[PDB]
Amino acid sequence: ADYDLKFGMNAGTSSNEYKAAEMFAKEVKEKSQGKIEISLYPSSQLGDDRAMLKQLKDGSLDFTFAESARFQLFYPEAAVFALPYVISNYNVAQKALFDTEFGKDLIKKMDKDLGVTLLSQAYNGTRQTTSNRAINSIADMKGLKLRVPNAATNLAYAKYVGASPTPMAFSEVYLALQTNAVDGQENPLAAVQAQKFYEVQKFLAMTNHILNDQLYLVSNETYKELPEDLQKVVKDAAENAAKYHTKLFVDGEKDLVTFFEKQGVKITHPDLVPFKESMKPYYAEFVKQTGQKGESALKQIEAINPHHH
Ligand SMILES: CC(=O)N[C@H]1[C@H]([C@H](O)[C@H](O)CO)O[C@](O)(C(=O)O)C[C@@H]1O
């Protein structure tokens, strides 16, 4: 094609992310009259999301996904998006990104500093905790070998609840669980399904601890080369795909505990009061480390009412 473009992702071929990216690719191909074709590179073929962001920056990858929280790698205050229990729901995550001074400035920096244009934002689920033994209360976390991604906020989740974290890439998790090299992991329900972690985890606990969004990102090196009518095709398709993406996650969060129970997983509902209590020292550390910019981002986000209006 005129524009042979590539979209990399950690998510696999059985995921909502992939299905939404397929929708995006199809609409772009159609509405561009075949000028643009977007090929997909799932399951961390191209590296992880840190690597794929670097490839968007240098122009060697055209599209990828990232959470708003992942920009904590560059702007420490952006960890606010994944401080456990801070962002209440997706309504808050949307307004945090688009309708705060903090979020608007973040978007501008992503463009200026990181070489990426934000096309759209979707919901990517609320993280829960699976394990090889029941989590009936916070006590059960103590010393649980809890896999986390290579992200400071998830490592802190594990530390502050009393678990023993083991960081590793998404691709490595299934084997780690299967072999009981670790005792558990944490991810939204849809990823537990997509990755078939339910095959290798007997328990799932509704810890509700981190709220993931998902940004459709394009390399500025690519976006600038598309004539404006094709930029519009891409942007509009990313917006349409993000709405679909969100819906996939919303619908699964109603349908998936019963799916897992039919697969033999035991579901628990530990009291979250002490989980939330355990994060208070972590918030204080975040404020100490990130200074006024972190205190301001918190304040801006804590001011957002979570009820749709
Ligand atoms: C956009 C993206 O790649 N998301 C991935 C996230 C983030 O890397 C992580 O939350 C840090 O931001 O990690 C996973 O949940 C994980 O490894 O368990 C896989 C998921 O596909």
Torsion, Cα 164 67 20 33, to 10 degrees, reads -150
Nearest CA to ligand 1 atom 8: 49
What are the structure tokens assigned to 54, written together? 């670097």
Contact 40, 7 (CB under 8 A): yes
1-309: what fold? D-Maltodextrin-Binding Protein; domain 2 (3.40.190)
Please, which experimental method was used? Answer: X-ray
Distances from the Cα of 154 to the Cα of 85, 187, 231, angstroms: 12, 10, 35
Distances from the Cα of 69 to the Cα of 10, 40, 72, 74, 93, angstroms: 16, 23, 6, 10, 10
Contact 154, 148 (CB under 8 A): yes
The beta strands (E) that lie in 59-138 are given as: 63-66, 116-131
Q: Give first-to-last CA distance, the chain, whole Å.
A: 44
Nearest CA to ligand 1 atom 17: 170
CA pair distance 297, 294, nearest whole angstrom: 5
| Short-list 133, 262, 252, CA closest to 191 | 252
The experimental resolution of this structure, in angstroms, equals 1.0
- Region of 143 please: left (phi>0), alpha (psi -120 to 50) or beta: left
CA-only gyration radius of the chain, Å: 19
Contact 9, 70 (CB under 8 A): no
Q: Which of 10, 75, 197 to mutate to test the pocket of ligand 1 (most atoms within 8 A of CB)?
A: 10
The sign of the CA dihedral 270, 188, 120, 293 is positive
Query: How many angstroms does the Cα of residue 7 sit away from the middle of ligand 1?
Result: 16
The sign of the CA dihedral 277, 280, 281, 282 is positive
What are the structure tokens assigned to 239, written together? 């917006």
Q: How many residues does the chain have?
A: 309
What is the helix (H) or strand (E) element at residue 305, kind and residue range?
Answer: none
Atom of ligand 1 nearest to the CA of 148: 18
Please name the residues in contact with 277: beta carbons below 8 A apart, sequence gap of 6 or more. none
Bridge-partner residues for 165, per DSSP?
146
CA pair distance 113, 196, nearest whole angstrom: 37
